[PDB]
Symmetry: C4
């Protein structure tokens, strides 16, 4: 019943910012006996992000943790705004608005836990996921059907493209 409300918020998005753990991954933090840390991403999310970028949308990562894995994933996907070691997601997002000349109302943010709440609440289009905390889900404009690390990002990428009448055009390039 909220589809066109969601569409109106997504239609004006010029910047798409994302949390990592629980969004681009299923939230697993993986350590081994040699001190090495591991993180897993989802292939379909990659193509979804490529689609947004192709449509002219600026991509950003804002995470409280810091790893080479995030740097590597961001670089291969052409995400050039990689903010790590930053729990205060909203201040980081506002920082980007000033850096890039994009209004906050034209920014999307997807997050899963409490550090993401304010950014999800205050962004033009705030998104969460089924396994997100209840409080961040409560302030979201949209909650994905697919879970983090299992297509949540791909799903909201398609949603934004649809709201901007760019989805069918993108699909047609593969047909």
């Amino acid at each position: 019943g909220h589809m066109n409300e969601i569409y109106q918020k997504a239609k004006h998005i010029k910047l798409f910012a994302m949390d990592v753990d629980g969004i681009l991954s299923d939230g697993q933090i993986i350590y081994n006996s040699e001190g090495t840390e591991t993180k897993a991403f989802y292939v379909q999310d990659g193509l979804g992000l490529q689609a947004l970028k192709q449509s002219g949308i600026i991509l950003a990562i804002i995470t409280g943790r810091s790893s080479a894995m995030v740097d590597r994933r961001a670089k291969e996907l052409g995400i050039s705004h990689i903010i790590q070691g930053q729990d205060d997601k909203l201040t980081a997002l506002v920082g980007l608005t000033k850096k890039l000349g994009i209004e906050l109302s034209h920014c999307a943010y997807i997050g899963d836990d409490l550090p993401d709440l304010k950014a999800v609440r205050e962004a033009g289009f705030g998104i969460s996921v089924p396994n997100g905390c209840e409080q961040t889900r409560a302030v979201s404009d949209y909650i994905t059907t697919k879970t983090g690390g299992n297509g949540a990002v791909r799903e909201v990428c398609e949603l934004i493209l649809k709201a901007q009448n760019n989805f069918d055009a993108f699909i047609a390039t593969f047909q």
Copy 2:
């Protein structure tokens, strides 16, 4: 039955946890270089931080021993790390005496048979959906979320709520 669960959680000063099956989904991972791997859940970290910040002491009691457990514990401020110990009750009782906290003010979460007595005898005993039937049977509470998937975060929030500390935790992010 949440009223009696909140009543038990109200008095908790020490929260002790098994590792495999609780903080992880129970996978023991090895590779051809001789390296062992373990996986944890990001939301459990924030939950344990909230518990610690509220004044509750955190402990790990595990039958295995690994560097991953030391790293994760250090990262989350788990100050009492007991590894290579299958006898969970003796370990928990040892902690009660050392810290000066009654067993009735201890919470313990476990998943398999070695955890049974500690879950049964602790002031607040918790298990998980994929815990063994016998350990689930003696639990005061079984989580909705599974081990390595938010069971720990869930218990953390329950204890915070019971102690009127949950909304203060949430408020910092609003």
Copy 3:
């Protein structure tokens, strides 16, 4: 539509496959030492071996590039390993020309948009439950089992059955 599916599968001489989301569940795994990991499914290995032994040529066509794919392919006797190639149809047509096999006698299994044209134009196009809707729409068959969980094994058995080789394959183990 199974009579039509069997018709298409009956004449397959080349079986070509996407990797991520087909042979794996789609996870791209990195670690802090710059190492990449990929996971495959054991039962898929036997299925592909069976297809190969029945006289079908095996091929991989993937947009990514890794040593893990080379290793898995060599292990299973996948003889055409095309990596760093998102244009699946051009690669597949290239194979038809090199091997002297009509496109109508090629099978292709894929999960996402880059695979769409190949799935559509191949003699037998296959996708998977978690494949994108657009690639599923142009498929001749969609597996019950998921990518990295037996989707490949399933279609291998389907092709063996369509070519009257399945029961004979089973018989070798009895």
Copy 4:
């Protein structure tokens, strides 16, 4: 139910496939050439319990890895036969050298290479995600899946059949 218990009651040797039984069947490779395999904690306790009750534990697998050696060592799995082409002839060979009749052997497997061993063992076991043909010749199919408690489940079944289960539980009470 009772026919299963009759077959399980006299088991002296419990032999197992690895991939799809002790694991969920994932074969994991990395860019440094390193292979990974995952096991389940609850299976560990189940196997240890079986071993302590006097049952000899064995692994018979077509693949070969250090991970299997490591997991076997920590659980007291004392016969580790890797890289085996024919699992039935490996089981027959092992049970002959140990002086145990095949009728007193259990074997759990998931795929076609396990079929003959599951069929011919005194107690043959498979798993839900096992192939239909191996499931067809099994005396018992577990409810839990490989790498997710299938082994723990059958261990408890055998303990029950040998009047050792309630005592096993009681040691933890």
